[PDB]
Design a protein around this nucleic acid. Sequence first.
RNA 1: UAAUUGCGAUAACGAACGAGACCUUAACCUACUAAAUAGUGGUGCUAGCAUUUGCUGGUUAUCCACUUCUUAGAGGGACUAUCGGUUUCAAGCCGAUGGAAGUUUGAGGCAAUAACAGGUCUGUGAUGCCCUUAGACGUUCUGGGCCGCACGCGCGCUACACUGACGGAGCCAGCGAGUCUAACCUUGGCCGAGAGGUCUUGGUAAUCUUGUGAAACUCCGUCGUGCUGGGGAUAGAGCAUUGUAAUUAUUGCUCUUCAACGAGGAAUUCCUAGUAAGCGCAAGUCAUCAGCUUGCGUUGAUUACGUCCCUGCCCUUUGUACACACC
Lengths: 141, 63, 206, 67, 100, 82, 143, 56, 145
Amino acid sequence: AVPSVQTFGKKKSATAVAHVKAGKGLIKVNGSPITLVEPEILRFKVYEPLLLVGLDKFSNIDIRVRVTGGGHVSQVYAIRQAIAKGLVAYHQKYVDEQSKNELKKAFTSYDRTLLIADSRRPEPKKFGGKGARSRFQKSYR
Amino acid sequence: TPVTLAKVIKVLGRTGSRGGVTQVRVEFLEDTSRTIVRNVKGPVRENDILVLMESEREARRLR
Amino acid sequence: FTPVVLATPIPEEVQQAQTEIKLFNKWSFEEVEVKDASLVDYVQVRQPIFVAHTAGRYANKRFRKAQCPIIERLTNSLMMNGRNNGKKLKAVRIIKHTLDIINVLTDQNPIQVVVDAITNTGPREDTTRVGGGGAARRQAVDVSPLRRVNQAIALLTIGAREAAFRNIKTIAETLAEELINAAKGSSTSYAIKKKDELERVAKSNR
Amino acid sequence: GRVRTKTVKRASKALIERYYPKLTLDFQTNKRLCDEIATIQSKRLRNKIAGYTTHLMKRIQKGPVRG
Amino acid sequence: IKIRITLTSTKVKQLENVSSNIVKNAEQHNLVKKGPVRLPTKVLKISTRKTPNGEGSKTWETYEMRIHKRYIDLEAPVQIVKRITQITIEPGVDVEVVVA
Amino acid sequence: KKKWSKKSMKDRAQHAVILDQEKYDRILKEVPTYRYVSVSVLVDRLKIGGSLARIALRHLEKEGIIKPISKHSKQAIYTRAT
Amino acid sequence: PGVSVRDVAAQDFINAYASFLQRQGKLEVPGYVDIVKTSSGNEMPPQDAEGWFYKRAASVARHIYMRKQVGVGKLNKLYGGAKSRGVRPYKHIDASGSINRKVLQALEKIGIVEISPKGGRRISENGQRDLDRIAAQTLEEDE
Amino acid sequence: LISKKRKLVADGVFYAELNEFFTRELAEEGYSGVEVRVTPTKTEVIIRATRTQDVL
Amino acid sequence: SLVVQEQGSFQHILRLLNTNVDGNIKIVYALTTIKGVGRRYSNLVCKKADVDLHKRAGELTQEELERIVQIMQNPTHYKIPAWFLNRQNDITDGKDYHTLANNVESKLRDDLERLKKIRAHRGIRHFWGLRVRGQHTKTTGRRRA
RNA sequence: UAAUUGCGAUAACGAACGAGACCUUAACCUACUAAAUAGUGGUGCUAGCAUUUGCUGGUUAUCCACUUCUUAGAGGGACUAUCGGUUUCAAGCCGAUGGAAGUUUGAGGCAAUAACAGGUCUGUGAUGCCCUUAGACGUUCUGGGCCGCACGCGCGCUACACUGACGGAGCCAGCGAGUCUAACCUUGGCCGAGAGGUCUUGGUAAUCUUGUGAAACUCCGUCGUGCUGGGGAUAGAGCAUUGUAAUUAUUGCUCUUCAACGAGGAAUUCCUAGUAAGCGCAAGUCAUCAGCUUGCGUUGAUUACGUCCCUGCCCUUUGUACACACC
Ligand SMILES: [Mg+2]
Ligand SMILES: [Mg+2]
Ligand SMILES: [Mg+2]
Ligand SMILES: [Mg+2]
Ligand SMILES: [Mg+2]
Ligand SMILES: [Mg+2]
Ligand SMILES: [Mg+2]
Ligand SMILES: [Mg+2]
Ligand SMILES: [Mg+2]
Ligand SMILES: [Mg+2]
Ligand SMILES: [Mg+2]
Ligand SMILES: [Mg+2]
Ligand SMILES: [Mg+2]
Ligand SMILES: [Mg+2]
Ligand SMILES: [Mg+2]
Ligand SMILES: [Mg+2]
Ligand SMILES: [Mg+2]
Ligand SMILES: [Mg+2]
Ligand SMILES: [Mg+2]
Ligand SMILES: [Mg+2]
Ligand SMILES: [Mg+2]
């Protein structure tokens, strides 16, 4: 009966599913430490869940993330949603509630996306234009 | 180069052939209780401070 | 602050910049107060962000565009002129290289220098075709504070774009001397020269 | 647009005329009456029926509504 | 024995009847079954210019038709498989039975 | 070709190709008082070329005179050290 | 303590492992090394032109050690890129398979990758540790 | 030996050919539609018309 | 790494194969001024003679120059794969040639005039001057002279 | 209000169509309903780092348990809900809150009366009339042509360089397709510089090609403001594949050759969030061939929320010498 829980985050078409369980606290990106995302700029954008509330809250729990689909910046956003929710989910029904709610204001105050994901999806293209909204061009002679 | 500071109190409406210029009545920050109307290009909310290179020119009322 | 040991090695430098205060990459977003009024509450300060890569849902409405940081605004104007439209990976990277330059020249805070330049560059007078009919010409009006930062940031980023075009000085450095000149003023800045030209032209139309 | 149509004005008006000693000023309770007290072909209409019902039931609280 | 059932009709409301009718038969017969698994609706698209001619505004509308597939696993002796393969027949509904 | 365009020429810059002692001693006595040196900085500065600048920063840092702060490709940011 | 190839970054690992073959220098030479274009989409060969048979093995083995089985056809789609076919738009073009086929053959006799069921090339008993032992000091190189 | 994708497309082909047959040959018999039912080892076709005794 | 200070062996534009090959540009791209040698042909010969490609052409020992040319003049003799060249089994003897500074325009004219006496379709179109590659000509090539 | 969308005097009583409602599609459900054709955790066998409890893996007749993520059916879920201002103060938006979802939530389908002498008799065995009907305007066969080239336009593609070009590395999508009495998609081994060929295998398909390892991309490099490693039009030579047959080169591969173009004038087009714009993939055409289209996913801006200036659109008043109606 190993204590564990699993939740997911997403982006435009990416879907990350982090596994949140009690442990030493090692973090993996599909096999590897979270220090190896390698856009080399988005690294603190995915370090946001770890560092905004501190690593003491992540000290007693380890997280393993599996990321599929989306683009390169999309997969990074996928990891941050699941990690943010996973700490919230773990602290809701294993840790006391008063930790969970104070974590919610820790996340939703700084960046709204961490717990509530975007409501924006690609739009179908239409005949009469190359993309969804633009037309080809027009010529009258 | 004296630049005047005035604060919007109300947004009158849009003005121009294509309505690109908004109508505004402002109150002077210093020497208050004086109101003037200025034609502003961009978007203006309330409680927004304006800066001018000229003070005694009221915009022509559209009426 | 205290170091934390863990199974996977997390280096010490990353930990420090978030415990004592939630910083930028390596710089600070506090004590960046705007000296000139009529721009505060339109230049977004007092909520730092780590990295300028963020997709904020800000597009349904008319006046919530004073809440996203000025830093990411400046990044989002680097992506323009065709071949580099989009590609925010390099827009962030270029600004990463730029802030290294204002750190070493003009030793003031690089965030402070950028914000000071924006206020000093936004024109406060512009022209508009107004008349009682066919007899219409240039007319002088005032620029709104929200349009000021719009007008200001446009000239700053396009100066580096045009100057680094057909010239060896890269976009990461050509944007530096523009900010350096835009903040204090030398009239050799691309943006400042455009500013005074635009204001004088509008002034002549009184 | 958020101006309700005749099929929402008339179905709602038919309810207060007949279900006054009945379903109250709270929407989520009203919509759980309409789904069985009336045969409505679409959920979106039923949701708009109990919507304009609550709006009219909130009017009848303070004074009467003419019509 | 490991008999497997498959349903590939284009009408869910007609096809869900056959799947419901076959799962209840084994359940009331007290035989272990593998529940009805519903495959994604594979989409056959045909897109054409509406006009028979080549003139006018280039309107391109699509005609779509959807294929709904179901398959169920059973383990039943020979005596009862014969009487269940010849029942639960519906128009426009295709069923194939494979043993092992 | 129907223009009214002038298509003016350029300055035809004469940036050096390879280093020499008359300039090698010049760089090591001129890299001070430069609070920022880079490949494009050392172009409007001492006339070494684009490849000369890149190899110079590779050399003047191998032994080391001033502290370097960036190793990212296509943009080198250096600064003098105390 | 424990050292894994996934515990080190990709760029430094392949760069360090590539040197080890150069130091050891016994595996093979195709015979036409440095004459081959290495793809049909790259309009110029390896610019350094010192390796591409000791440094390609550094990056292909990392994938083969990572995943279950990879064949030569998979590399062509993997290492390939858009080919600028002149005035035409870009298009994905595979890579030269002969070097991909023959680099794996050298890996056979050096005990890194051997024949595997269900087709393809899979790492051998000596293969797993050799990569990890080499990747070990790439972590202790900091001291 | 056919893909299930092709089968149901060719299934609709069978109906369209049958429909155009049963409207051209039974035109004066009050033909009003057709539908095909598939059974193992047996195929059914229902010709729905008005003058059934004339159809037969 | 280490940078060579200076030496007196540096020379400006030099002469070989009737072409004044420029200095101060790498020998892999300096030898693309001569016709018959492209971006690749220079790359192949410079390494087959054991010449430092990184080393420029302005500083290049004289004895290393003529080592290059005999490799360029007779590539097949010096273990080339032999499909690099632009004239193989050319038209006359089956020997593998590669046109160079003088013979690139000489053999082009011979290839030009090979099909004119034959009265081929390609030869006539070259004499006519239009596109011999079978392109549409209704709209392309209006400012051809 | 987007909407004769709603609503209250008052010579009108209701209705029908349109819009809307509806159908499809898009995102939420850790609650209902199941799954080695999808997965996850654990136990067996086993590989590596360490050896100390851990980490990264593989395994089909080794099972066990479960359905967050993926598929689904029936459903639930939003109706602008809660609150302050506005107008015989008669109902939404603003301001904020809630939430996955608050521009009818986004986008499509459907889409009225009446007309155009709009296009179409080259889709039809759908047709009237006219023509023709045996050296036939019927059919078929051989070789050409539709491509032809002084020039003028249209829809477009590649670009004029360091926000770069090129080289080694990291490396991520969804929409779909696919052979039977046929020869389709083909992984894997081998050969080949490449193209491509060769020998088996898998697949009638969530099990196989496919995670379609797309590209734009990110790291290390080389280059360095030179019409230069930008740009690759033109040409010359050779090797292959499709096709009975490619010569006015089908297309692919290899080397050489290297033009304009230095950001383009009057003019003119489209466009308001995952939208423009940039990037590529699939399918339709396909024995061979995209620079087309129809879709899909990827990165993701600036500027408004406006007005009647232009060009159009809708309703009312007024004038009319107009009615095939301002051409
Ligand atoms: Mg697009
Ligand atoms: Mg430039
Ligand atoms: Mg690549
Ligand atoms: Mg492109
Ligand atoms: Mg096992
Ligand atoms: Mg209210
Ligand atoms: Mg709609
Ligand atoms: Mg017709
Ligand atoms: Mg005929
Ligand atoms: Mg034609
Ligand atoms: Mg068109
Ligand atoms: Mg690249
Ligand atoms: Mg996919
Ligand atoms: Mg090129
Ligand atoms: Mg227009
Ligand atoms: Mg296709
Ligand atoms: Mg609008
Ligand atoms: Mg009159
Ligand atoms: Mg009159
Ligand atoms: Mg008349
Ligand atoms: Mg007139």
